[PDB]
Amino acid sequence: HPYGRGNDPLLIQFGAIFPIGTKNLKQNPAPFGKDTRRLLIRRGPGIYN
Amino acid sequence: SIVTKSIVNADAEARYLSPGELDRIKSFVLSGQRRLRIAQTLTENRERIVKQGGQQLFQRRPDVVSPGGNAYGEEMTATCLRDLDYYLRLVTYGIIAGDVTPIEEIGLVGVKEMYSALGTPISGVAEGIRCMKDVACSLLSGEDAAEVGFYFDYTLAAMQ
Amino acid sequence: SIVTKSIVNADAEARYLSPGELDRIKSFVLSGQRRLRIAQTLTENRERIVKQGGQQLFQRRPDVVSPGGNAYGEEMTATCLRDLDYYLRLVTYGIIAGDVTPIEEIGLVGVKEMYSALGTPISGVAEGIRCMKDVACSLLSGEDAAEVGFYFDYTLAAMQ
Amino acid sequence: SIVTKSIVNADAEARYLSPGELDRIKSFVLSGQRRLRIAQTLTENRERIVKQGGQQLFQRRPDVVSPGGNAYGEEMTATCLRDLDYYLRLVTYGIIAGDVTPIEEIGLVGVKEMYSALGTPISGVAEGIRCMKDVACSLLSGEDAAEVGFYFDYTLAAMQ
Amino acid sequence: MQDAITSVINAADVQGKYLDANSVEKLRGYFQTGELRVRAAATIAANAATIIKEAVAKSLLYSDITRPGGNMYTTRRYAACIRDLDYYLRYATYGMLAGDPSILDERVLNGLKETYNSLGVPIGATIQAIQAMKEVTGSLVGSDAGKEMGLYFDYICSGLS
Amino acid sequence: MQDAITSVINAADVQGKYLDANSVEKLRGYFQTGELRVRAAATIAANAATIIKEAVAKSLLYSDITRPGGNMYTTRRYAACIRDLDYYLRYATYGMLAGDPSILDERVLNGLKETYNSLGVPIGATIQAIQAMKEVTGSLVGSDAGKEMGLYFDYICSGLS
Amino acid sequence: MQDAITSVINAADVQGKYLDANSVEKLRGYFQTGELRVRAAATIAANAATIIKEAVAKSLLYSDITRPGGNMYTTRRYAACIRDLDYYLRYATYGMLAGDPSILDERVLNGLKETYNSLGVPIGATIQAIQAMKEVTGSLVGSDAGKEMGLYFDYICSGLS
Amino acid sequence: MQDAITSVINAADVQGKYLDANSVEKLRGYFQTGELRVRAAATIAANAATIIKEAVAKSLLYSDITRPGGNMYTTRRYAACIRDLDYYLRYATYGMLAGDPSILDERVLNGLKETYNSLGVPIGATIQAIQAMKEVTGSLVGSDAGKEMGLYFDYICSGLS
Amino acid sequence: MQDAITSVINAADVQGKYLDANSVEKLRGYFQTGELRVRAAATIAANAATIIKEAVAKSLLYSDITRPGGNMYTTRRYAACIRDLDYYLRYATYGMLAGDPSILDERVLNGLKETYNSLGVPIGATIQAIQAMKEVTGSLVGSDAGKEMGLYFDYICSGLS
Amino acid sequence: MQDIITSVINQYDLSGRYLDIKGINQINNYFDTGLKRLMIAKLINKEATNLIKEASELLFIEQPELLRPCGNAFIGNAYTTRRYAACIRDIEYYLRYSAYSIIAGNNSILDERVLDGLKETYNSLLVPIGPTIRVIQLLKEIIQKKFSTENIENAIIAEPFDYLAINLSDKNL
Amino acid sequence: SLVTQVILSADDELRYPTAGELETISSYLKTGEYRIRLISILQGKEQEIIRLASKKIFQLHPEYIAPGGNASGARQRALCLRDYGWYLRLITYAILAGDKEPLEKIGIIGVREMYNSLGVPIIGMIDAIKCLKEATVEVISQEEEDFVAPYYDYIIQGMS
Numbered sequence A: 001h002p003y004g005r006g007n008d009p010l011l012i013q014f015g016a017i018f019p020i021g022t023k024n025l026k027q028n029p030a031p032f033g034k035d036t037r038r039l040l041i042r043r044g045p046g047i048y049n
Numbered sequence B, C, D: 001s002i003v004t005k006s007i008v009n010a011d012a013e014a015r016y017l018s019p020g021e022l023d024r025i026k027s028f029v030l031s032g033q034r035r036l037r038i039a040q041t042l043t044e045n046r047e048r049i050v051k052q053g054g055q056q057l058f059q060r061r062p063d064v065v066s067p068g069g070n071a072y073g074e075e076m077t078a079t080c081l082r083d084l085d086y087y088l089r090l091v092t093y094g095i096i097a098g099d100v101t102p103i104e105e106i107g108l109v110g111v112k113e114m115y116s117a118l119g120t121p122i123s124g125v126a127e128g129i130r131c132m133k134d135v136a137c138s139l140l141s142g143e144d145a146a147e148v149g150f151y152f153d154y155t156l157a158a159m160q
Numbered sequence E, F, G, H, I: 001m002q003d004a005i006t007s008v009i010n011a012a013d014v015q016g017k018y019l020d021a022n023s024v025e026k027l028r029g030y031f032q033t034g035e036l037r038v039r040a041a042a043t044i045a046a047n048a049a050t051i052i053k054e055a056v057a058k059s060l061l062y063s064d065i066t067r068p069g070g071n072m073y074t075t076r077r078y079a080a081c082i083r084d085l086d087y088y089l090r091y092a093t094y095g096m097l098a099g100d101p102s103i104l105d106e107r108v109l110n111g112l113k114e115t116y117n118s119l120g121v122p123i124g125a126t127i128q129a130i131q132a133m134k135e136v137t138g139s140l141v142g143s144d145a146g147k148e149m150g151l152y153f154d155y156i157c158s159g160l161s
Numbered sequence J: 001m002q003d004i005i006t007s008v009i010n011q012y013d014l015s016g017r018y019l020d021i022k023g024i025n026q027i028n029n030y031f032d033t034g035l036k037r038l039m040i041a042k043l044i045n046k047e048a049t050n051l052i053k054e055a056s057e058l059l060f061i062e063q064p065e066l067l068r069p070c071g072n073a074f075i076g077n078a079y080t081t082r083r084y085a086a087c088i089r090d091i092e093y094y095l096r097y098s099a100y101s102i103i104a105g106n107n108s109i110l111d112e113r114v115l116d117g118l119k120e121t122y123n124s125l126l127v128p129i130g131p132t133i134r135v136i137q138l139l140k141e142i143i144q145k146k147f148s149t150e151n152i153e154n155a156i157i158a159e160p161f162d163y164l165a166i167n168l169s170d171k172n173l
Numbered sequence K: 001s002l003v004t005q006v007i008l009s010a011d012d013e014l015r016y017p018t019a020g021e022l023e024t025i026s027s028y029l030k031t032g033e034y035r036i037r038l039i040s041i042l043q044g045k046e047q048e049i050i051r052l053a054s055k056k057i058f059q060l061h062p063e064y065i066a067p068g069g070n071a072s073g074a075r076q077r078a079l080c081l082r083d084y085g086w087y088l089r090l091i092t093y094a095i096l097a098g099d100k101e102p103l104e105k106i107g108i109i110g111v112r113e114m115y116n117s118l119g120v121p122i123i124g125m126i127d128a129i130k131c132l133k134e135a136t137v138e139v140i141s142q143e144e145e146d147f148v149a150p151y152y153d154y155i156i157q158g159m160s
């Protein structure tokens, strides 16, 4: 995430499962600019990116 | 409780609590003395409220206890009364919370999946809670019986 | 600037820059000599452009400086002119960047939240920038006053 | 290079660079014209320095190319000369960096783990670099051959 | 997301027992302060903008985070603050009514200090803003009500630290 | 998401060669068991609720995860189980028809053990439920069909471990 | 996303000072090359498809990533390449105009090497494609313009490494 | 760090009951395979360097991670691999003897995939190296012993994924 | 730890003198041999392993210290020798460059003969190992350079005696 | 770290090719200004203790708030002499690592030894980033006062100090 | 000296000197006599220079010479020239062994606590060395004084 790593949920069928928390201890803040584009991957072919 | 969902209501709406919400949190906490007395009556009457609860349940539904019924034998009949002790306990929570929110997420959400998956007739357990309701409201005055009975019939509604 | 958003425009469209985009980056950099002269005029005229800027602002809005106004006293009036020094500085950035992109993300985005949260009349600070505009365009020729005034009125538009 | 580790030396010691360190960065950059000429000689002599390098290597170590040797056949012999092209390249880096720091963290650190894990006789590849050294120093004058040969024998030392 | 009644019911339910004298003893203690919390949440709703205006002017208004280079320079960045301070004064109001700080870490604290480090927001100036905001909140609601509302402010400051 | 035919075509395609005798040799082996898998998937669809009712009553019905404090106490939590066990018996049916366990880790296994640790779901009791569910599935579909359906159950249990 | 003028204004603003002689000294240096960059970005827009066709045929056209099993075998995978190489030649054009490589890591570099490792895309062949693409770009725009456009190609190759 | 006996004792102890017939039933199953695991761990200790030399030459020896730019180019980086592959073949030997993969995630898996992403190590090539290393390990120890040693390799590959 | 040009900055200095004609006369004598010492230290660095392999094969193998019971029997004990002989050939190289044997007794000689008596290492065979190592060192660096490198070998042999 | 040379050689190693002439032209540009990069460095050692002193007075003459009480924001400016002693110490570092980095001809030594965690450290102590960057370029103008008649030494001196300025900024645009 | 720094710095890594370091010894020894020729020039001008150092250290700082200052009195001023003599003698050592250790193992390491226990103002001694370097430029030509210039200002950097 542009905020820390404990912000993107698990991409499962049905969720609200955020593993990073007070119980897991696996956190990683990184500095991201006010504008920036994450590199998403198309669930499908490649030219429809 | 009324305090937690009056908050999460006004929480979602991006606003604070109105007088309609804060004159009822106020009205509920002054009601709190009378609620603990009502729950205190059902707390140490579980011996009679449950055992007489299963009294009328078997007289009205002898199939569930007869050979072939789900609660047949010394074993299942003990668990047959165990669930009534559960639901009688949750009604004591709902009376003190001033809402069926404790009864909602315990013993009501997905209850049909459990009892259908246990082979238990869900209509039969609904008959059990109704028998407990007549015993419970018989232990309290009219002003209280409109509450203690009031939480049972909600459990009756969601259990069918 | 015109260079950075002509890029991010063609960036999003998965393409390079057209002649319409590259004949204007070209046209802008040859304009760069004339832009620095214009910003150089406003750079060391901030003493008059700000102080005469707050001149007409108080004559047109005596409420903000009168007792009860937001900029009342020796203290707030100094900060009352401090913001005009800010916005006069951002106009020098917009003239050199050839766009209100520097003025956009500084002093314009969410400006109503700040001044509403400071108790300052946002219409009053808009009147201050207009008073600075007449002083600024009075310092330059007609060909330049169509630019230096041009960035002020954009700030006037976004500030209400 | 001499510039980067003369810095990280004085970096660790919480101090600046002494005259002993700054009269050698000075002495190294005036040496830089002569270094590029030396590396320029080895740059487009890799065809002869490598191919004649593997010339003497097989005449001195026929086991490695004989059937059962690690570099047996058309395949491994091509890779047999590929590594010599690598190490000849790193010597060109060390000559321009004025130190074996490029050769240190490339092709020297943990080199025995690689070649032991590839089944290659590490002594055999050391013989290959020595054969390249006689070809390289035969291409330069005495003042240069004391340098170009100087980096090979360091690679010989660390490779056993 | 549990209030004092929800937390009391949970602990009494998690052992499968009824609400004995000790569980109702705390519940009676919560109902006694029910009148105090609403009036505390009443005035805080009225003076929400005034409290935040008082805190920032008293803690971090003129410090060099406010000046260029500081963490609060641009108007978008300044406007994010009073938006950001509004949640602390708002969610603390929810904890003061619910009587349980579970809503704070559920909806505020988790991923918060990990987020400010990403943006580079100074946690030191943030806590002092909340401390100053706690100081003005004790002005309005009184002493004991300020003790209640103040009890959740430092809970935010503790976890955010 | 590949079946036995998709996996055979992929490996034969990934080398750019045609379907030689070895590739068709496995394909003929899959078509021979095509009749067995449908009848196996037939009865499992019929007795889906009965199989899950048999597994939970045989493995974890009366253990103290079922009692208060255990991982399965509340009715929402109990109802999540039979919902959860339905996927294992369902996706295992898909692997039994497709003849390839690629669908399991694609849609079940990935982020699964990492999810149960988040919720605090006991992986030990989960596998024994699937093992007991595997035991009843061999009752219905027979021995060899149970060997086929059972071959994907422990694949779930292995990766979920 | 800053150009040379944005980066100069930021550093001069971040200290709260005006644009002194050193800040304008670099700005004048950028305006001098403003004429060169547009013509460089002009011809690159014209020969976008021709440059990418030249790079792949010169670097990785016939290598065994192109053959079966290689990383570029299937037509979807081959078509993803020239789609993928188009961004490198396009975003490098943006850096050449803006005079600052901030847009590359903002929109290309971040999560890029971490993405190719996920897909299993060979970073070694990728950089040599960009190096070959850098070599043909110096053909069109000339020497110094190729030095400018080439200065952002290896920036991509460095961070992507 | 539990073996099969430690895990059996823990589950039988965690309910406070003695070792009944079901707990000893699995323990007898572990003692039956005790003879197989030692001979499996015997030959793996002998051919440790030979197995790793076979895996890298069969999976990732000549791929372009081995060439310049690839993830394994420099000799320090190549030497880190066989050092790194030695742990997978070694810790998998420990899991094969202990009969429980608890030691792997305790000492290998935790912070592993989070570490390779930091270094930029390709997880895709790593798993195929372990898969190829699993393939040669089934050569030495036999079929069923390879099934045992192979059962912990893919456990590493699953969690490392 | 003093070199030549740093032993004259103690003698011209510990009494508090300056650098007169006699002090600089020796310093000029050291700078004249500065070219010889580096080339001597150059080839010794190259043939470090070859020199030690030549010395042990020429002197102390040959005599029942190598056989069982001798002082060098076990592989740990044999490996300690070439480790031990490496220091003598290495520190002698330092004395040859520094032009002063102060580093030897500072870092080698002190507690050395008192240590070999503790371990029971034969000082007689050790001196022969260094004398033979001195003989091969005169082969590589030449006559006069061998005279220089040889001048520090017997310094070790004298003090170690 | 990496100088201009080693950074150039890693540029050609990643691609696994020998040094061409475009690669060598980059090295020659260092070797030409390399002799000029030293007396810039040698002037700094002779002017080191001075150049920090002119930077401090030029800083506090514009930021008198830095020598005053912090306000209730517990902020680390040069309030007390304990604060002032350590705060002058930071100007030591910015002049030092920007002195090596003038000789390396590359900002590799800067970011890994100065920039990495700099916003981390200052956000902990609440240190001014604005005035901290302004003192970095007060040094730059002060150093460029000596080499001013020509203008090819000026770009050399500007490169380290300009790099810290752009990198310590929270990006407004 | 410089060779001692290479033997030491190569000794903590348990290795022979690399290719770059042997340059650093070889280049240092080839510039040998020129340090030797230079120190004889300075030794013949020690009575030259310290007389000029006492010129400007005291016209700059009459606080120390006056009654009450540390250097007041004959015998206090007598050693005053002696400290210049030892420093100038130390610099001849540093000019010869081409580095800073004779200026650092003596003179610099712990100099402040020496002077602070003596009453000599440590800032005054910095100007004394700066005065001494100012005095050495007159009796030395432009060729060789920048050879000796970096050895002086290291002392000033060491004393702060």
Ligand SMILES: CCC1=C(C)/C(=C/C2=NC(=C\c3[nH]c(/C=C4\NC(=O)[C@H](C)[C@H]4CC)c(C)c3CCC(=O)O)/C(CCC(=O)O)=C2C)NC1=O
Pocket: A039, A040, A041, A042, A045, A046, A047, A048, A049, G065, G071, G072, G076, G077, G078, G080, G081, G082, G084, G085, G087, G107, G108, G109, G112, G115, G119, G121, G122, G123, G125, G126, G129
């Ligand atoms: C703008 C910055 C940016 C980049 C660069 C980017 C890359 C990117 N490259 C992709 C795939 C790909 N990329 C390649 C590329 C290659 N194969 C090779 O052998 C070569 C070395 C290389 C061509 C130079 C291939 C073959 C795929 C398809 C992978 C697959 O189907 O598994 C994908 C997956 C989704 C899709 O293509 O639709 C993304 C997101 N995304 C971004 O936002």
Ligand SMILES: CCC1=C(C)/C(=C/C2=NC(=C\c3[nH]c(/C=C4\NC(=O)[C@H](C)[C@H]4CC)c(C)c3CCC(=O)O)/C(CCC(=O)O)=C2C)NC1=O
Pocket: B064, B065, B069, B070, B071, B072, B076, B077, B079, B080, B081, B083, B084, B086, B087, B106, B107, B108, B118, B120, B121, B124, B125, B128, F057, F061, F062, F066, F067, F073, F074, F075, F078
């Ligand atoms: C707090 C909310 C809540 C409820 C209600 C609940 C019910 C519940 N009822 C159960 C069993 C049972 N429940 C019954 C119930 C009945 N038989 C009849 O004839 C009657 C109609 C009916 C009772 C009035 C029987 C016979 C079993 C045992 C079934 C078996 O052994 O297969 C079990 C499995 C054994 C156990 O762990 O107790 C659970 C979990 N759990 C909860 O957390």
Ligand SMILES: CCC1=C(C)/C(=C/C2=NC(=C\c3[nH]c(/C=C4\NC(=O)[C@H](C)[C@H]4CC)c(C)c3CCC(=O)O)/C(CCC(=O)O)=C2C)NC1=O
Pocket: C064, C065, C069, C070, C071, C072, C076, C077, C079, C080, C081, C083, C084, C086, C087, C106, C107, C108, C118, C120, C121, C124, C125, C128, E057, E061, E062, E066, E067, E073, E074, E075, E078
């Ligand atoms: C670069 C874009 C930008 C702007 C514009 C800006 C404004 C800004 N104006 C402020 C205060 C203020 N601003 C005013 C302004 C005014 N009073 C009036 O009557 C007039 C209508 C008006 C000025 C023309 C006053 C009175 C205060 C002090 C308010 C107080 O003390 O409560 C403050 C708080 C004190 C400070 O840190 O300076 C900020 C941050 N910051 C920025 O970064």
Ligand SMILES: CCC1=C(C)/C(=C/C2=NC(=C\c3[nH]c(/C=C4\NC(=O)[C@H](C)[C@H]4CC)c(C)c3CCC(=O)O)/C(CCC(=O)O)=C2C)NC1=O
Pocket: D064, D065, D069, D070, D071, D072, D076, D077, D079, D080, D081, D083, D084, D086, D087, D106, D107, D108, D118, D120, D121, D124, D125, D128, H057, H061, H062, H066, H067, H073, H074, H075, H078
């Ligand atoms: C830049 C530093 C560096 C080096 C040195 C290096 C070596 C290296 N040598 C290799 C193979 C090899 N190397 C040899 C070498 C030899 N056979 C002989 O008989 C001779 C003694 C010797 C050469 C003189 C052989 C035969 C192989 C192939 C081994 C096999 O196929 O199993 C491989 C695996 C294939 C490849 O990716 O090229 C690497 C990575 N990599 C590096 O990054």
Ligand SMILES: CCC1=C(C)/C(=C/C2=NC(=C\c3[nH]c(/C=C4\NC(=O)[C@H](C)[C@H]4CC)c(C)c3CCC(=O)O)/C(CCC(=O)O)=C2C)NC1=O
Pocket: A012, A013, A014, A015, A017, F065, F071, F072, F076, F077, F078, F080, F081, F082, F084, F085, F087, F107, F108, F109, F112, F115, F119, F121, F122, F123, F125, F126, F129
């Ligand atoms: C298709 C692949 C797939 C699976 C398997 C899956 C599982 C999954 N199981 C969940 C919960 C759950 N799962 C269980 C399960 C159990 N409790 C026990 O004691 C047993 C050991 C076990 C039954 C076998 C319980 C009780 C919850 C509720 C946890 C809670 O409310 O905290 C949740 C949280 C959300 C929800 O249920 O709505 C998910 C997402 N999601 C998927 O996409």
Ligand SMILES: CCC1=C(C)/C(=C/C2=NC(=C\c3[nH]c(/C=C4\NC(=O)[C@H](C)[C@H]4CC)c(C)c3CCC(=O)O)/C(CCC(=O)O)=C2C)NC1=O
Pocket: H065, H071, H072, H076, H077, H078, H080, H081, H082, H084, H085, H087, H107, H108, H109, H112, H115, H119, H121, H122, H123, H125, H126, H129
């Ligand atoms: C016991 C559990 C455990 C593991 C597994 C472990 C891994 C580990 N692997 C590392 C590096 C590495 N690992 C590799 C591995 C590979 N390159 C490839 O292309 C392949 C896919 C792969 C070999 C299979 C490389 C090349 C490095 C060096 C990275 C670098 O220098 O940047 C490092 C960095 C430090 C070092 O090696 O000294 C650690 C800590 N640590 C542990 O405690």
Ligand SMILES: CCC1=C(C)/C(=C/C2=NC(=C\c3[nH]c(/C=C4\NC(=O)[C@H](C)[C@H]4CC)c(C)c3CCC(=O)O)/C(CCC(=O)O)=C2C)NC1=O
Pocket: J066, J075, J076, J077, J078, J079, J082, J083, J084, J086, J087, J088, J090, J091, J093, J094, J097, J113, J114, J121, J125, J127, J128, J129, J131, J132, J135
């Ligand atoms: C090599 C790169 C590098 C830097 C720059 C660095 C800075 C650094 N500055 C510090 C403190 C400090 N720095 C200052 C500095 C200032 N106060 C102001 O008001 C001014 C804006 C500014 C002077 C320009 C102050 C006051 C402290 C002490 C804070 C306190 O204790 O109150 C500290 C904590 C004390 C310590 O050094 O252990 C560190 C580590 N460390 C590094 O490794």
Ligand SMILES: CCC1=C(C)/C(=C/C2=NC(=C\c3[nH]c(/C=C4\NC(=O)[C@H](C)[C@H]4CC)c(C)c3CCC(=O)O)/C(CCC(=O)O)=C2C)NC1=O
Pocket: K057, K064, K065, K070, K071, K072, K076, K077, K079, K080, K081, K083, K084, K086, K087, K106, K107, K118, K119, K120, K124, K125, K128
């Ligand atoms: C090799 C390095 C070295 C030094 C430098 C050194 C200095 C030194 N300076 C001393 C005294 C002194 N030094 C001074 C010096 C000065 N007054 C001035 O105005 C001047 C700036 C300065 C001389 C240039 C004075 C006044 C005293 C006498 C203080 C007293 O005893 O009352 C003393 C006490 C005994 C003595 O005079 O010998 C020592 C040891 N020792 C060393 O080993």
